[PDB]
Every structure is written in structure tokens, then in C-alpha cells.
């Protein structure tokens, strides 16, 4: 089975310099091309980087030429990029892949920013008191105010997965991201059942359970 | 190089015939590649050299080309077929992709269902106020909110998120946030989201009075 890992992602400063590195398994790359790609935040699919690395030969995207350099270890058989200058530009999902490009590893996230991190804070979204008796109501959380992506949300601690939609981010004028997570249940368990969302921002650390009550 | 794709989104059933092409701006020979990509996994490669199926990709997968076309069929769609697919060009360096095509599943029309959230007291302490209006599980995507503030339309002060299709009903919701700030908010009484949607009569309001519990 063959497999490629990337890691090395994360959240670094305009300008700066970050390594990935891409662990192969289940085939050696001595015996084709390692390739990086990446994909912003909608913007298609990009081509960035190549290496052969039984001779150590390399290509590169123009918008990326010199200040990045892609680079191999055979004996550990994994590559790297070493990214410099970067750029808000760069902002994407790194996904490296071998030579068609027949296997691809999940990527890894890099986010240039001059932002700080920043944990969420959590509000009820509250079921309404005009809720339809017999029926179905709404009840959710705000997930506002944190930066970089990602957050997670569940809820009950995973028990309650049935009608959840956790939206997208929305970025806000301010820069930080929010979002909303939502769930329909029955009106009859407004009074006897309890509802907490679980909340997840890696980024900052930040673990946070909000009970949801009417 | 640059490679053309349309279009850029369609919907479809399952046994349909899909066609999805492929326009490279110079000659590129054989040297394509289609990939299948879905939310926050690895692109997977189906047809290598413009007409060879990759081993384990099942048979109703096929590309052909006549000149600089290049086209992606899929015979007979079955649902896990539902995704993203791009086309490649690896004649020459670099290779390049086309900008992508989402398939997406056909249904039955269905209307939403129509929520309206008051910013909770918690967030009103800490200092903000976000109004909220929910659809939930609708077809088509295509939707319309509007705001209203004392019956006053509200313009430019709202922002939506969409889910993508639900992986058991094949619908979409949609969350909308009016923002304020707390001063503004308290400045007026009756709050209300409108819907128009294909699946309704006639839109639909939902609305609550600042304060009441």
C-alpha cells in the first residue's frame, strides 16, 4: 500500500520561513518524482514543486522560484520544502504526490498571516419559546471571534449526530472567523433532555462546552 | 498551457451519462490526466494519458480525446461517483490543472424549514449582537433572505454560509447573520427574516420581538 504523509503546516508570519516534509511508505523515491501542489482557499489546484531524487533534479512554479527550494532524503525516504519570503499568497492546503500523479497525501494546512491567534468565544443559539408543540425545533452555537481555521464542533460529547449542520466559516470584516453550528430535535425534549456543544480550536488550545438550554 | 474545464458545476441522477471537458490552449498530445477530489481528502487519479483507466477505478470511468479535447465520461453514475473532478496536462513543465467540475445529486424539490435566532444575552454581555435566520434541509441551493429591521429592508449588513450537500437527504441549509452593533440593536423592535425559495408557496417570515423570552 502505498502511502505519502505531509506535515510540517501551521501558521507563520509574512515573510517568514516554514519546512513540510513528505514520509513515503509502501515504495522508494528513488524510483520517481516527488511533486508538491497546493490549493488555496478557492483557487483551484497548482502545481508548485518536482524532484527526482536519485540525481537531486528540480523544477519549480515561477511563483515560487528561489525563495522556495524542494529537496530529498533517500535514506529516509521522505521530501521536503523549505519555504521562504512568504507570502499571504502562499496561504494554501500543501499536498505532495509521485509520479500521472497516481498517489497524493491529505495535505497539510499553511496559513501566512500577521494575525495572532485568537480562541473563540461560545454563545448559545437558544431553541425559541414559540417553538411548535409536537414539532420540530432549532437550537445551536456561535462559535465567534478566533483565528486561524480550524474549529470542530459536536455535540453531547458525539452522542447527538442525527440533523447537526455545522456551517462553514464565515471570515468577518474584522478579520476573525465565526461560525455556526445547528441542530433540529424534537419540541417534546426541550424540558428533559440537555444540549452542550463541544468546540474544538486546536489553533489556540481552546476547549469549550456550552450547554444549550431553552 | 492552460486547460479549459466545463462546466463548472451540473447535478445529476444515478445511472445518468455525464460528460465533462477539457479545453488545453496549445497542443498537449496524450499527456492528460483526469483527478477526483472530495472535501478534505487526497485527489485521486482515474484516467491516466487521456484514455487508460487506473487499476481499481472501476469501468464506467472513460476519457478520449480528438485534438485538444479531452473529455471525462462517466457511463453510468453511482453514488459515490458524487464529487469534484479536474483535468491535468503533464506534456510540458509546469503541469497545469483545469479549474474543476462538481457534480452534484438531483432531487425532488423541498421546501425549508425557517429559523430565527435572537442574539443570546451572553453575547449581548460580551458586547456584540448577531441576528441569525436558518434554513434548514432545502432543493435547490438557490435561495433568497431578506432582512427587515421595524418592517425597514435591510441591505449590506448581512453575511450567509452554506452547508454542502447532506450525504442522506441530498439537501442544502443555510445559515444568515445580520450584524449590528449592541447600540443599534436596541435601537428598534421587530426583527425578521424573509425566505423565498422555490419550494414555497409564497415566502415565508419569521420574526421576534427584542426582549421577549
Known amino acids: 500500500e502505498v502511502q505519502l504523509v505531509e506535515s510540517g503546516g501551521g501558521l507563520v508570519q509574512p515573510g517568514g520561513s516554514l519546512r513540510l516534509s513528505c514520509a513515503a511508505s509502501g515504495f522508494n523515491i528513488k524510483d520517481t518524482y516527488i511533486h508538491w501542489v497546493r490549493k488555496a482557499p478557492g483557487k483551484g489546484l497548482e502545481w508548485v514543486a518536482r524532484?527526482?531524487?536519485?540525481?537531486?533534479?528540480?523544477r519549480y512554479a515561477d511563483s515560487v522560484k528561489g525563495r522556495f527550494t524542494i529537496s530529498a532524503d533517500t535514506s529516509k525516504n521522505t521530501a521536503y520544502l523549505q519555504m521562504n519570503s512568504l507570502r499571504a499568497e502562499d496561504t494554501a492546503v500543501y499536498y505532495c504526490?509521485?509520479?500521472?500523479?497516481?498517489?497524493w497525501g491529505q495535505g497539510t494546512l499553511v496559513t501566512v498571516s500577521s494575525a495572532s491567534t485568537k480562541g473563540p468565544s461560545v454563545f448559545p443559539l437558544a431553541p425559541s419559546s414559540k417553538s411548535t408543540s409536537g414539532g420540530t425545533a432549532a437550537l445551536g452555537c456561535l462559535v465567534k471571534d478566533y483565528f486561524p481555521e480550524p474549529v470542530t464542533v459536536s455535540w453531547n460529547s458525539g452522542a447527538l449526530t442525527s440533523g447537526v449542520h455545522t456551517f462553514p466559516a464565515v471570515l468577518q470584516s474584522s478579520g476573525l472567523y465565526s461560525l455556526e453550528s445547528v441542530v433540529t430535535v424534537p419540541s417534546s425534549s426541550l424540558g428533559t433532555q440537555t444540549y452542550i456543544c463541544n468546540v474544538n480550536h486546536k489553533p489556540s488550545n481552546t476547549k469549550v462546552d456550552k450547554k444549550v438550554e431553552p | 498551457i492552460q486547460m479549459t474545464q466545463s462546466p463548472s458545476s451540473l447535478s445529476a441522477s444515478v445511472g445518468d451519462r455525464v460528460t465533462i471537458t477539457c479545453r488545453a490552449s496549445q497542443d498537449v498530445n496524450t499527456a492528460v490526466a483526469w483527478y477526483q477530489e472530495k472535501p478534505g481528502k487526497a485527489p485521486k487519479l482515474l484516467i491516466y494519458s487521456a484514455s487508460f483507466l487506473e487499476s481499481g477505478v472501476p469501468s464506467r470511468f472513460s476519457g478520449s480525446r480528438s485534438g485538444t479535447d479531452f473529455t471525462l465520461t462517466i457511463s453510468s453514475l453511482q453514488p459515490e461517483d458524487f464529487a469534484t473532478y479536474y483535468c491535468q496536462q503533464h506534456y510540458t513543465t509546469p503541469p497545469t490543472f483545469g479549474q474543476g467540475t462538481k457534480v452534484e445529486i438531483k432531487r425532488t424539490v423541498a421546501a425549508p424549514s425557517v429559523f430565527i435566532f435572537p442574539p443570546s444575552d451572553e453575547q449581548l454581555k460580551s458586547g456584540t449582537a448577531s441576528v441569525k435566520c436558518l434554513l434548514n434541509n432545502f432543493y435547490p441551493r438557490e435561495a433568497k433572505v431578506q432582512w427587515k429591521v421595524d418592517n425597514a429592508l435591510q441591505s449590506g449588513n448581512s453575511q450567509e454560509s452554506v452547508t454542502e450537500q447532506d450525504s442522506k437527504d441530498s439537501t442544502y441549509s443555510l445559515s444568515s447573520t445580520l450584524t449590528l452593533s449592541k447600540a443599534d440593536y436596541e435601537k428598534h423592535k421587530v426583527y425578521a427574516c424573509e425566505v423565498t425559495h422555490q419550494g414555497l408557496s409564497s415566502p415565508v417570515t419569521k420574526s421576534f420581538n427584542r426582549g421577549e423570552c
Open positions: 504526490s509521485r509520479w500521472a500523479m497516481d498517489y
Open positions: 524532484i527526482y531524487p536519485t540525481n537531486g533534479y528540480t
